[PDB]
């Protein structure tokens, strides 16, 4: 009989069994455990500001061979230290020590993207100016 | 089948379609009743009374002749036992097994069988209590079981 | 490595952890 | 996957079978799994059955046989070519080989 109760009065058993078994679904488990609230560096937010500590080059994973140019950022809201990728050709020259950068994820929702190892965030703005605007010379860095 | 085993045997009796006495049967509905009471006073259980009746008297079924089942007739004549027959034989078997177990402590098979027999006793006694054949406070006690089936 | 020996290695390491914690109870 | 429906032994409707030692290496092998061969060989080789009959003091003396039942593990038997690797479809054939 398919291994689950079918009786008209077995709604409690069906509801409890489903409730027990949804904990095997990591999306449900992460939503109810609040891991983003407790464990995520951003605390569940989409973006987060921070201060650039140092500019660091990270070797890409095999089979790729390159130096992904990231920064070490200390978040203002909680003081945690994260590594954030600086996208596009030469935008590392736009990022200086002790700058305030707005960060966001890579879109893989907490996982590293591509060949970049251990990096889960990217720089969106620096010194309050969009990195895309700086790259395309639409605006200038206030200095 | 086999509540407490994996057997699936189907052997049993097949009652005839006819619900009337055979044409060759000549005894009256009374003479069977006095024969039943005579054997019940000799101490036979209803199963044995029916066995002696068909084996030696041609009474194929006591119901098709007398009109009542054997235990129903004994209860109508005050000869019904206090403990029902099947529960009595189950308790007697449990008494025999427990008595063997106290002398053979390493008989783990007998310990397992005793658990099966006693579970079957408790299920049957629960039924008899729900149908008010046994008192609602009736309980099977291993210590005092030998007295009932003495 | 073989699963049986991996299990044995982990059992010995749990044993060590318990013995180490017992020093300070 | 499953190679044999019999799991390489002959245990059905049974829990445990006591072991036997391989004749060649003394390995413990279940009695149903062991490769067993019954051999009845002449005790005297056919070359010597003549000179021993001539040296015999008895007229019409029958040479006794040698009865033996040999148990092999799978490795003993495969190595000694008592059994050989068969094709996937030929594995199912369990009649004695038609040689005798």
């Amino acid at each position: 009989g398919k291994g689950k109760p079918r009786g008209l009065n077995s709604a409690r058993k069906l509801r409890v069994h489903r409730r027990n078994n949804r904990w095997a679904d990591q999306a449900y488990k992460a939503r109810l455990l609040g891991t983003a609230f407790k464990s995520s560096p951003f605390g569940g937010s989409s973006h987060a500001k921070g201060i650039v500590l140092e500019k660091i080059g990270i070797e890409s994973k095999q089979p790729n061979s390159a130096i992904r140019k990231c920064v070490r950022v200390q978040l203002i809201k909680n003081g945690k230290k994260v590594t954030a990728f600086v996208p596009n050709d030469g935008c590392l020259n736009f990022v200086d020590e002790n700058d305030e950068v707005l960060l966001a994820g890579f879109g893989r929702r907490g996982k590293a993207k591509g060949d970049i190892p251990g990096v889960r965030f990217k720089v969106v703005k620096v010194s309050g100016v969009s990195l895309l605007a700086l790259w395309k010379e639409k605006k200038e860095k206030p200095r | 089948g086999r509540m407490h085993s994996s057997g699936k045997g189907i052997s049993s009796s097949a009652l005839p379609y006819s619900r009337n006495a055979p044409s060759w049967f000549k005894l009256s509905s009374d003479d069977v009743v006095e024969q039943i009471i005579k054997y019940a006073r000799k101490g036979l259980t209803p199963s044995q009374i029916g066995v002696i009746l068909r084996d030696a008297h041609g009474v194929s079924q006591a119901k098709v002749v007398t009109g009542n089942k054997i235990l129903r007739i004994l209860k109508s004549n005050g000869l019904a036992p206090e403990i029902p027959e099947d529960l009595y034989y189950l308790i007697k078997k449990a008494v025999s097994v427990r008595k063997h177990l106290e002398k053979n402590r390493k008989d783990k098979d007998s310990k397992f069988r005793l658990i099966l027999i006693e579970s079957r006793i408790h299920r049957l006694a629960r039924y008899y209590r729900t149908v008010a054949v046994l008192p609602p406070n009736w309980k099977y006690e291993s210590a005092t079981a030998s007295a009932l089936v003495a | 490595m073989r699963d049986k020996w991996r299990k044995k290695r982990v059992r010995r390491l749990k044993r060590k952890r318990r013995k180490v914690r017992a020093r300070s109870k | 996957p499953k190679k044999r429906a019999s799991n390489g032994r002959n245990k059905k409707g049974r829990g445990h079978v006591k072991p036997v030692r391989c004749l060649n290496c003394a390995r413990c092998v279940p009695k149903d799994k062991a490769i067993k061969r019954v051999t009845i060989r002449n005790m005297v080789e056919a070359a010597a059955v003549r000179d021993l009959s001539e040296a015999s003091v008895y007229a019409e003396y029958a040479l006794p046989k040698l009865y033996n039942k040999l148990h092999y593990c799978v490795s003993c038997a495969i190595h000694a070519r008592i059994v050989r690797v068969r094709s996937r479809t030929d594995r199912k054939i369990r009649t004695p080989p038609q040689r005798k």
């Binding site: 079918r6 009786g7 008209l8 | 379609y17 619900r19 | - | -």
Partner: protein, 129 residues
């Protein structure tokens, strides 16, 4: 154990029809089995059927005419309001023009079209097409 004699009866009918047999034996019988068969027979999905009295639950021999695609029970017998009949017929029947969901209503055991005619509803019991 034996929890649904209607399920056993319909399973036997389905297996005989799938194997091309023109008759099937059902044991045990019951009123629900007979009235389910009467609904199938009235709509032509089975032929004549026969009740055999054995001073017990009984037996039935059904004549099959090859028109039956599938008959089955719905366990459990859900309570069905009139507005739920549409959901059941949508899920169970192959098309909107043929097939029947059998209900047991206080007006009797009947197919969903007759139930709509007399504006009654009960518990779902099975289907046939």
């Amino acid at each position: 154990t034996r929890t649904s004699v209607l399920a056993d009866a319909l399973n036997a009918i389905n297996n005989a029809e799938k194997t091309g047999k023109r008759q099937v034996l059902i044991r045990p019988s019951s009123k629900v089995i007979i009235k389910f068969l009467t609904v199938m027979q009235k709509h032509g999905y089975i032929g004549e059927f026969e009740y055999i009295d054995d001073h017990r639950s009984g037996k039935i021999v059904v004549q099959l005419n090859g028109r039956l695609n599938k008959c089955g029970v719905i366990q459990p017998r859900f309570n069905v309001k009139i507005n739920d009949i549409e959901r059941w017929t949508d899920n169970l029947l192959p098309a909107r023009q043929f097939g029947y969901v059998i209900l047991t209503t206080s007006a009797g055991i009947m197919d969903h079209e007759e139930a709509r005619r007399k504006h009654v509803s009960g518990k779902i019991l099975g289907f046939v097409y």
